[PDB]
Amino acid sequence: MRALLPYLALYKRHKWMLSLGIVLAIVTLLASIGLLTLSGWFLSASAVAGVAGLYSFNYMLPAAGVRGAAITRTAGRYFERLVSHDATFRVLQHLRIYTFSKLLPLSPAGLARYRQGELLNRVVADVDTLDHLYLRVISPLVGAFVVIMVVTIGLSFLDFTLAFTLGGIMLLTLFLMPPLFYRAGKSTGQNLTHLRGQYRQQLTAWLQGQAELTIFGASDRYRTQLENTEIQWLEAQRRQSELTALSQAIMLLIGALAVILMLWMASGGVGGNAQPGALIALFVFCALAAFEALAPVTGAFQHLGQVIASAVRISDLTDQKPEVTFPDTQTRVADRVSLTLRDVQFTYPEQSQQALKGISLQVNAGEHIAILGRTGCGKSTLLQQLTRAWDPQQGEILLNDSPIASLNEAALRQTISVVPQRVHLFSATLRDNLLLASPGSSDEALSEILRRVGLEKLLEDAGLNSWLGEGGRQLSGGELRRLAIARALLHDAPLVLLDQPTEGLDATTESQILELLAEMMREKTVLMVTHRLRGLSRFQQIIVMDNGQIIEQGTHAELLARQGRYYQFKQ
Amino acid sequence: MNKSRQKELTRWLKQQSVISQRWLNISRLLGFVSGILIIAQAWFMARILQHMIMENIPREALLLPFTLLVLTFVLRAWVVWLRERVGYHAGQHIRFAIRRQVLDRLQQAGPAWIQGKPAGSWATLVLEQIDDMHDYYARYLPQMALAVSVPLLIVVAIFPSNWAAALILLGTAPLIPLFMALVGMGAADANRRNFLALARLSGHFLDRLRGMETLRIFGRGEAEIESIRSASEDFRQRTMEVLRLAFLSSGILEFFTSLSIALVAVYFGFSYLGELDFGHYDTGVTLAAGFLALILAPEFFQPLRDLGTFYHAKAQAVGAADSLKTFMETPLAHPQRGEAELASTDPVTIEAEELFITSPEGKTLAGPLNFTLPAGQRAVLVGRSGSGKSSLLNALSGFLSYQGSLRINGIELRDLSPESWRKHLSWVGQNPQLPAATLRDNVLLARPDASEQELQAALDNAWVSEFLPLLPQGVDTPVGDQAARLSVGQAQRVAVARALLNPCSLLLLDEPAASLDAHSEQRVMEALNAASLRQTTLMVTHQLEDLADWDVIWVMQDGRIIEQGRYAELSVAGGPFATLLAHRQEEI
Numbered sequence A: 001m002r003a004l005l006p007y008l009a010l011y012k013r014h015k016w017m018l019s020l021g022i023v024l025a026i027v028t029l030l031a032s033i034g035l036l037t038l039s040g041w042f043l044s045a046s047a048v049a050g051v052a053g054l055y056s057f058n059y060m061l062p063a064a065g066v067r068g069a070a071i072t073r074t075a076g077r078y079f080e081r082l083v084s085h086d087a088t089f090r091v092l093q094h095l096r097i098y099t100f101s102k103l104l105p106l107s108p109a110g111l112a113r114y115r116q117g118e119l120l121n122r123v124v125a126d127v128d129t130l131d132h133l134y135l136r137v138i139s140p141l142v143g144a145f146v147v148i149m150v151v152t153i154g155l156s157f158l159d160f161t162l163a164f165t166l167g168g169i170m171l172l173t174l175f176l177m178p179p180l181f182y183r184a185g186k187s188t189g190q191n192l193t194h195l196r197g198q199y200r201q202q203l204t205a206w207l208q209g210q211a212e213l214t215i216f217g218a219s220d221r222y223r224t225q226l227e228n229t230e231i232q233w234l235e236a237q238r239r240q241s242e243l244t245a246l247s248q249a250i251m252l253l254i255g256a257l258a259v260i261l262m263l264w265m266a267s268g269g270v271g272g273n274a275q276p277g278a279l280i281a282l283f284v285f286c287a288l289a290a291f292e293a294l295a296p297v298t299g300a301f302q303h304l305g306q307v308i309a310s311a312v313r314i315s316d317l318t319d320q321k322p323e324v325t326f327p328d329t330q331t332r333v334a335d336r337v338s339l340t341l342r343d344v345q346f347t348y349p350e351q352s353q354q355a356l357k358g359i360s361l362q363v364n365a366g367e368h369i370a371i372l373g374r375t376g377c378g379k380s381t382l383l384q385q386l387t388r389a390w391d392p393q394q395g396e397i398l399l400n401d402s403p404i405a406s407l408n409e410a411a412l413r414q415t416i417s418v419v420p421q422r423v424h425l426f427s428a429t430l431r432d433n434l435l436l437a438s439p440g441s442s443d444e445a446l447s448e449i450l451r452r453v454g455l456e457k458l459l460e461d462a463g464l465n466s467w468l469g470e471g472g473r474q475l476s477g478g479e480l481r482r483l484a485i486a487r488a489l490l491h492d493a494p495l496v497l498l499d500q501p502t503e504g505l506d507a508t509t510e511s512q513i514l515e516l517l518a519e520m521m522r523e524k525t526v527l528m529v530t531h532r533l534r535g536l537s538r539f540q541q542i543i544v545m546d547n548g549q550i551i552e553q554g555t556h557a558e559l560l561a562r563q564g565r566y567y568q569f570k571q
Numbered sequence B: 001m002n003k004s005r006q007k008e009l010t011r012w013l014k015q016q017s018v019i020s021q022r023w024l025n026i027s028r029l030l031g032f033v034s035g036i037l038i039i040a041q042a043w044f045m046a047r048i049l050q051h052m053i054m055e056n057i058p059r060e061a062l063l064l065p066f067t068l069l070v071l072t073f074v075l076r077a078w079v080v081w082l083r084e085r086v087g088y089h090a091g092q093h094i095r096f097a098i099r100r101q102v103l104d105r106l107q108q109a110g111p112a113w114i115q116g117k118p119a120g121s122w123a124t125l126v127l128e129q130i131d132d133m134h135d136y137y138a139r140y141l142p143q144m145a146l147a148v149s150v151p152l153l154i155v156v157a158i159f160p161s162n163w164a165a166a167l168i169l170l171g172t173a174p175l176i177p178l179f180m181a182l183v184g185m186g187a188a189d190a191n192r193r194n195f196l197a198l199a200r201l202s203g204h205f206l207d208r209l210r211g212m213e214t215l216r217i218f219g220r221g222e223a224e225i226e227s228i229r230s231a232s233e234d235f236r237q238r239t240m241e242v243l244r245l246a247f248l249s250s251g252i253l254e255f256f257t258s259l260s261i262a263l264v265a266v267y268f269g270f271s272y273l274g275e276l277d278f279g280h281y282d283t284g285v286t287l288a289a290g291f292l293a294l295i296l297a298p299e300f301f302q303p304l305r306d307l308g309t310f311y312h313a314k315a316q317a318v319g320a321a322d323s324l325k326t327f328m329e330t331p332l333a334h335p336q337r338g339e340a341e342l343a344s345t346d347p348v349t350i351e352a353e354e355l356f357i358t359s360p361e362g363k364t365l366a367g368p369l370n371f372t373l374p375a376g377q378r379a380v381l382v383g384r385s386g387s388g389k390s391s392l393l394n395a396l397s398g399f400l401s402y403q404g405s406l407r408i409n410g411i412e413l414r415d416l417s418p419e420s421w422r423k424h425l426s427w428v429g430q431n432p433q434l435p436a437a438t439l440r441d442n443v444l445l446a447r448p449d450a451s452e453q454e455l456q457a458a459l460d461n462a463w464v465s466e467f468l469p470l471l472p473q474g475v476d477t478p479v480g481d482q483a484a485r486l487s488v489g490q491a492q493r494v495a496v497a498r499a500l501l502n503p504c505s506l507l508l509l510d511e512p513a514a515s516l517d518a519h520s521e522q523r524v525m526e527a528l529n530a531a532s533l534r535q536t537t538l539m540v541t542h543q544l545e546d547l548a549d550w551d552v553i554w555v556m557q558d559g560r561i562i563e564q565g566r567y568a569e570l571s572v573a574g575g576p577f578a579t580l581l582a583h584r585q586e587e588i
């Protein structure tokens, strides 16, 4: 239960609004006990006085008391909800944005330890689960403790044994029953939080792989695995209902005990007199109405085992230290970039062998480099080292003869343009898919780069306002490839890392793209990775990798003459 | 907010409750029995109170009323315990059936219809939206009968004692439904926009998370926080708009409840003093009559305040059902699910006549396609990007609707049984994905109970087995988020291993050797060329030199097949193929 401290500390930004809801939750309860307690005494006192009591019994004061309590009861509860729900969902909105802010610093390797379907559950579903902590844990518990003390102290003036008997039952239920139901529903709450994220992960994975699962006949047995999670989830959901049912049955029996005891004990004597008269109804009707202050008390702690389980999920995500950290010093983006690598080594997390083994190359400013090798030789791993995705072990990378770890992130991203091997089409519009790089580009500039790269088709119909990605138009494989090139051409960085840019493109489009890149990417440092040996005569150096090490190196003419591994690639 | 539409959703919501009709009637009975025991509870309480207060009867004489009063309390707690569990059991059976229906239509819809929403929008439509219909079935449906039966039963016990007290209850009773419907008339539309904002936030989050690398590369950390801030700000405002209608309705209903309890107390207190004397059947107002009309004063309005509370659960269900109904109404790729199935496992013959392939929206992706592909022959799809080559392979897979004629072995594809049709299909798709957990679970996707020899044979053919030593666990290694553990070229060969592990009647290779070098492509294309001869095959590829023995070469441009024939005929005949082959080996 100690895991809730980082989240109870979020009260402090709304301390007034959340404490006002506590005060209104006591005024509402006090007026609620009073309305039934005053009515119970007023009726009995009026009847005892009888007809002869008129002109001598002050009946106007209770008449204003019930009218005042009725308005206070209804208005206080309404304003408590308005002020407590307003503050709770401002805390949940800040905590959701805070949780999302921890994702990008962990993007390459920290997020790989997690599952993409349960990460979604943590930010949108586990954050909403914490509204129990801010709405119905503190206010019911401290609201029900002040009310009982006020009732017990108030009833103590009339009698002591009666007040402590009613108040004793009311505290023996406030202090013993909630922890009993927290312990009973602790295991179910853990499962209920865990199984919801397991189902949301299996459902999104089943929805995202529906093309591969459907044809290979695997949707049926992945839905059976999916349906089973729901059976277990619905079973844990059912157990929480059986405890809620038992909570109401027990709470109704305790209120029965208070009503029976007050009837049996107040009749004997209230305050030391044999005939209590109206005071008998003053205690019976209080015990009959005082137990609506303990209505939300038991459910407050029962659902706590599920809130604590949720709180651990957000705490785990927000307690992750990103592997790569950036200096805060401001620096200016250079116009020319020359990169130097000296014995760069790198082992992927939870691996024994090395993806990169002692890579050393010197790329001068403005030189165009082509990297070649078999699949799995570390070509993309090398290109992600230059992007500071991971920190190389026992290796040093230099941009302009300065360490790449000494660049501000807002300056590192402005000096490197990347075309990844796998392109992502965001759900946003076509304009916002191109405004990732160069957010200040105008609509005329966006349209021009699309015409150059061969995507003039996207300018038809809705065009720039057209919704792409999921929920909209899905581009083909060769149209995603040219949209990634459009993103990097808009970025306009001195150093460009192309990871198989002409992949899945026909000969006509590849010729047009390679012609565009040669003209566009002049006086720009380029590290062009491809498995395609076309247009390599215009690259100053050709790097051939194998198993994380550079095997051969030289110009296109030199490599052919030497008949190295590049020769078997070409022939 | 269309009343005609919201009446269709309520009709659909009520239809799903028939599966739990028996459980919804038991809770209607148990709720009435609770109303019976409440009346019995206060009648004993009033009689005990009057005897002690007025007649000064000693407590040791009143033992029968105390025993019966305790007996009522024990029975009250039992019925409340039963009704709460009976209500839940009805609620989860309807929710399970609703979710089974939605998941059933996602198997049939296929990727082209699942792609119509972000994957985070589907998740919040299957988990959050379906689970928020529970209180409509568990709580609101049984409450309609209890809001009319118990309150009427309450005042039937008051007419005999004091009619003036009952007219206080009946005087305020009609006001509650009038304000229940007036306040919560826009509650169903606010809930619909609330789930709309949740489905955007859920869907916008998972899209950024899946494309989280491209945000890191371009330095979009500050810009995506601001967009999540806007998406989450709308969700907070939609949530509070929904809640303000629930608090206002509950506040108004409590206002009338509280005043009537005050009026009942004031009327009886004044009546005992003689301040006002009416509504007592020309007999002195007894104390037991006042207590009975005072204990039942909150209980008369309880069922009405619960109806107001659950009336906003109905609005929650109506708003949640707006998006499920839309999904369950939109026609799928084929208007009628096919029952016809082709018997033999022999290679099939593909035929198309004026075949148009259209997107789920309605946009045509491939123009009029006229072609034939005899049994066992292999064809090649070649053309520019965006020409429709992969759209044709998606229509053969059954993922897309087609207007014209596309006959498999003389049987229309729209008529084929989709489940039995995919058993005759293997394929390597463009940008292939690995759904299963491990590398072995992925290669064995078609039949997970394949022998060790047949698994080893697929890994050897697809060149997968050469990079297995690098993997820590071997063929049992996980692949992670979007096959993170593997490189693109290594993930490509695992997808190729799937296609070759089971015999098929039509093989649909879509750029099967992408992200492969010169030598690894040649090793893989030996397996794919050998496999292409065992059945009907149709591959999309950009290599043009390596293909010379393929039975026919289709050249697609703007959705139309503009050339056909062998490599020897097409290469020297001019046309688009020669020009598209001209850029190939241009410098060699």
Ligand SMILES: Nc1ncnc2c1ncn2[C@@H]1O[C@H](COP(=O)(O)OP(=O)(O)NP(=O)(O)O)[C@@H](O)[C@H]1O
Pocket: A457, A472, A473, A474, A475, A476, A477, A478, A479, A504, A505, B359, B360, B363, B365, B384, B385, B386, B387, B388, B389, B390, B391, B392, B430
């Ligand atoms: N769901 C869709 N809605 C609208 N247009 C689409 C959709 N899917 C694809 N298109 C477009 O339809 C055309 C054909 O797409 P597609 O069939 O994938 O091209 P392709 O044959 O695969 N060429 P390639 O890029 O090499 O894969 C392109 O212009 C696409 O942008």
Ligand SMILES: Nc1ncnc2c1ncn2[C@@H]1O[C@H](COP(=O)(O)OP(=O)(O)OP(=O)(O)O)[C@@H](O)[C@H]1O
Pocket: A348, A349, A351, A355, A374, A375, A376, A377, A378, A379, A380, A381, A382, A421, B467, B470, B484, B485, B486, B487, B488, B489, B490, B515, B516
């Ligand atoms: N996220 C990862 N975790 C662990 N190992 C990885 C990861 N990504 C790649 N590897 C390993 O690194 C090796 C090569 O990595 P990399 O992806 O750089 O190769 P590549 O040259 O990009 O391959 P291709 O050229 O086919 O895309 C592979 O053997 C692969 O198993």
Ligand SMILES: [Mg+2]
Pocket: A379, A380, A381, A421, B487, B488, B489
């Ligand atoms: Mg790669």
Ligand SMILES: [Mg+2]
Pocket: A476, A477, A478, B389, B390, B391, B430
């Ligand atoms: Mg394609």
